[PDB]
Amino acid sequence: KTALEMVQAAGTDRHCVTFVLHEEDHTLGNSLRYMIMKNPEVEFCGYTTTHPSESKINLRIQTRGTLPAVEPFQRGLNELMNVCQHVLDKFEASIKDYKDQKASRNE
Amino acid sequence: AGILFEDIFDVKDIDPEGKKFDRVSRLHCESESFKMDLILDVNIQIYPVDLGDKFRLVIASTLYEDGTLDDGEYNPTDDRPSRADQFEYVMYGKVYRIEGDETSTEAATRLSAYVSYGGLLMRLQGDANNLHGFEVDSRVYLLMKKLAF
Amino acid sequence: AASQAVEEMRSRVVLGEFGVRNVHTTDFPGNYSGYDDAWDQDRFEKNFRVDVVHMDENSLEFDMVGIDAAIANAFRRILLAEVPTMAVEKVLVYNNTSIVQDEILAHRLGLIPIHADPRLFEYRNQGDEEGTEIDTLQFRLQVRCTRN
Amino acid sequence: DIVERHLIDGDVVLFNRQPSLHKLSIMAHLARVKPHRTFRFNECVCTPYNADFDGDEMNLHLPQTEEAKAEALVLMGTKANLVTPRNGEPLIAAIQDFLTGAYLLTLKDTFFDRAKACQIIASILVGKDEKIKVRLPPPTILKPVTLWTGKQIFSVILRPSDDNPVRANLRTKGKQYCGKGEDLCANDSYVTIQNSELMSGSMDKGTLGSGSKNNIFYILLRDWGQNEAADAMSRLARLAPVYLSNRGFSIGIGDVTPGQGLLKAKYELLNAGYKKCDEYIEALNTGKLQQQPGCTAEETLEALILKELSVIRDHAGSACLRELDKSNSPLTMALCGSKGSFINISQM
């Protein structure tokens, strides 16, 4: 199967890279563009849908200077993985403590 | 020090024809060193200018004293201490429509200059020799700062 | 005086009689020339918090502090579709003697949700209609009307 | 060996309507297979066909011989046929929604940031643009906030990159020209594009509208080649609508509501009009109303009170404009000129 493709610009060899993601929507596009805009080494980053009856998303990444656009992608993706991991870890403990406290105060 | 123009202005009128926008307003200024009419638009939400205030206006290029002229502007990088940290309002626009005074049909020496900061208009009038540079096509940075005394 | 309205512009969102100002979320590096924000992960961990307001039989109300709209909207979007569950797909009707349509009956039966744990069941391969034991649940329905 | 295969993408296929009056009612486009079981095409080319998009069923033809496949591409070409032989005005510029979006984008009131600018120009690299580097123009106002100006977003459609040699130059006025100044206007209704970048003015029905001269795409096609006019017509249809959808444009019943200070303004007019018109009756009965035109008694009375009724409506409509807000959706559409006019506002 085809997960992701890479389209590099004719002029810029490793400065303007467009990743083509298959079978995805604006969910992973907006979170990823946020995570990459959090990075200070990125100039232009943006996702767009090819067609509403399709599932191909073009996501462009540009870095200020001479730096490949593949590293910030995985960097932001791992940072988002850690963010959701921590969000789940805190939510589980909050739910647990609230539930045990409610059960205690009820009976 | 590539200073194209610098002076101290005072606001006489502000937004005379009612109010149309919610973030931009017209400004009418005047000077004391050289007789000149300066009109520009500034953001009220960011820079809340009021009536009867004195500010300092500087039009120049090449913020950094080190470099001759640089290629691209970087937002957080501060390699060279520029003039923007000392002031409090920065714009980057270009000049166009170099025309003069048309009221005086015979000999006059009053020249005007129009600048467009990507939508916001600026009109300057004044002496011929006071305007030393101000070429037809020039990328110029505007610098404004409040002077409260 | 103006710096205060500046930090308040990005913190809270003002509501007017017509139109809403300060809508876009600006907390990225290079935007503001007074502060710096690149990741601050360890600082973000101590600023984020979750609370539970109300928890009912089939409704949960919770609160998230210190988070943007992007990941929250992603959560809300994937809560609907990407979370799988079980539902009726295929229907064999033996003898339909009534007024309702067979297609409408199948649609209304598929609209019926099922109290089952979808974690134990697998995902069906590309295609098979015979039905294995691990990825298909059988249900029977039979009723005929008689006089009293 | 002759082989007949199915319709593939990249075919010169004719698409037209049945009520043909002019010669631009039939055109040839490139075919595209899409599984939705319906005909789909761009809205900009809807004016040549004069479709209404509610009950229209258009037809489609397929050339069979290779000799005719090349003749329908050079003569009946969408890029070639953009002006009409009747007068010479460009017929394919824009429709109501795109005009309204382009007007709301450039208002000398919109202010973006570094992040939203990268998203508005993110929906513009979709086609032959993936192998093209896009540039970020220098920001105007950055001492405090480094925020972006919405008028510089619109200048990207003209010059998307550094390699594209597009240098447009237009200087004209709008439909709301206040006067008393050529480019120091009060409502900024004066467009001045220099070196393919917007300097002043807001885009209205007279600048990029269909059925008008001094048009953006028209001047772009006259100065440069015609291929650059069609590549920049679809870039606007992908930039304006998404921004308009994310901004929010709506109309309710609160928009059209009479002001309390307006009800007594027209009450005076109606009372004075009635008091003045109901006098000419007994004036004619007594024998009066000296006549300038050669006519009969009832004819002069028919037009003497006909000008008394239009004054009430005109004065009411003119006093209503000072009573409305600056965000009224019907008034906004009237100022833009997409679908509506001041007559409809004064009538509603």
Added chain:
Amino acid sequence: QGRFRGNLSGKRVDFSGRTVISPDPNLRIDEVAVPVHVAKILTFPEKVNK
């Protein structure tokens, strides 16, 4: 409904169709979307080169 401008002028064509139109602002100026059901019926003859 004659033979001069009814048949000779008319001469109803083949390899054609007609369908209701719908908007799609995701194509170019010279593009049009054709359903696959119609594309399967229509055929275009061409000779095989090398």
Added chain:
Amino acid sequence: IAQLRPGQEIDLLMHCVKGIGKDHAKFSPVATASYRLLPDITLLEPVEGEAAEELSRCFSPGVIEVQEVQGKKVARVANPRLDTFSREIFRNEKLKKVVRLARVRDHYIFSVESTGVLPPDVLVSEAIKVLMGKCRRFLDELDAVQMD
């Protein structure tokens, strides 16, 4: 489901399979998935008695409490949470400069309401894992891509 009469019979056998809500609406595991920004009501000047009692009625009940203490009839914000935004303060322009409505853009109130298939407190915890399921599957192939 259906209505029968004397002389009618219905017999069906349905198959239940696993699916995601993006395929069909019947595979939606949650009935309502929504959130709300935290409200904020900030007063500017001290109000008088009747103005306070009239402002208490302009809002939803239980927002602005009128404290009457021995000389004063002041208004006080106690709980702005239970307040549906109707912005009815701009109806009468008599006060018009007493309230400021805002939304704190780091506070989110999520209210999940499940149909009854699974507890709603587990749906949010599963959505977090589903969000990273793809962030991991993309890195899985990026590993092989950068391996070359």
Added chain:
Amino acid sequence: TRRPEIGDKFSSRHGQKGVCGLIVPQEDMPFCDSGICPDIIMNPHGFPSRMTVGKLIELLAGKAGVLDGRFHYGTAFGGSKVKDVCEDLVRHGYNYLGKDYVTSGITGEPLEAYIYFGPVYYQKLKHMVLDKMHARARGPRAVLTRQP
């Protein structure tokens, strides 16, 4: 049995006919506060030229009725006014005329301007695209003249 698709003609019972455009899933179609999604998106650009004011009044009356719980009369040269109905829409807690605070879904950001929400009686018409669709390459010909 048929389902609505792209190319079907619908009406608004107010002289406003149109074919369907894009079929949008539920992740889009923003909710305002409670989680109510737009069932059919209407364009505000066809209102001024057509000059139809009864549509907004009917929407307002229908919303007030479904909130209160009684049918509102809308007969010609009478019925109900817009003075007693809007003051009744305040008792519940909504805005008085038409406006609500919406939160865009594709981005996750609020909308600057307010959107007009409400229930409307729509009707489905004939002339589906399923029957208004024809294509022919080589078929039968007439015996008098060899023509389609």
Added chain:
RNA sequence: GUGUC
């Protein structure tokens, strides 16, 4: 003959 553009 009816219905739509």
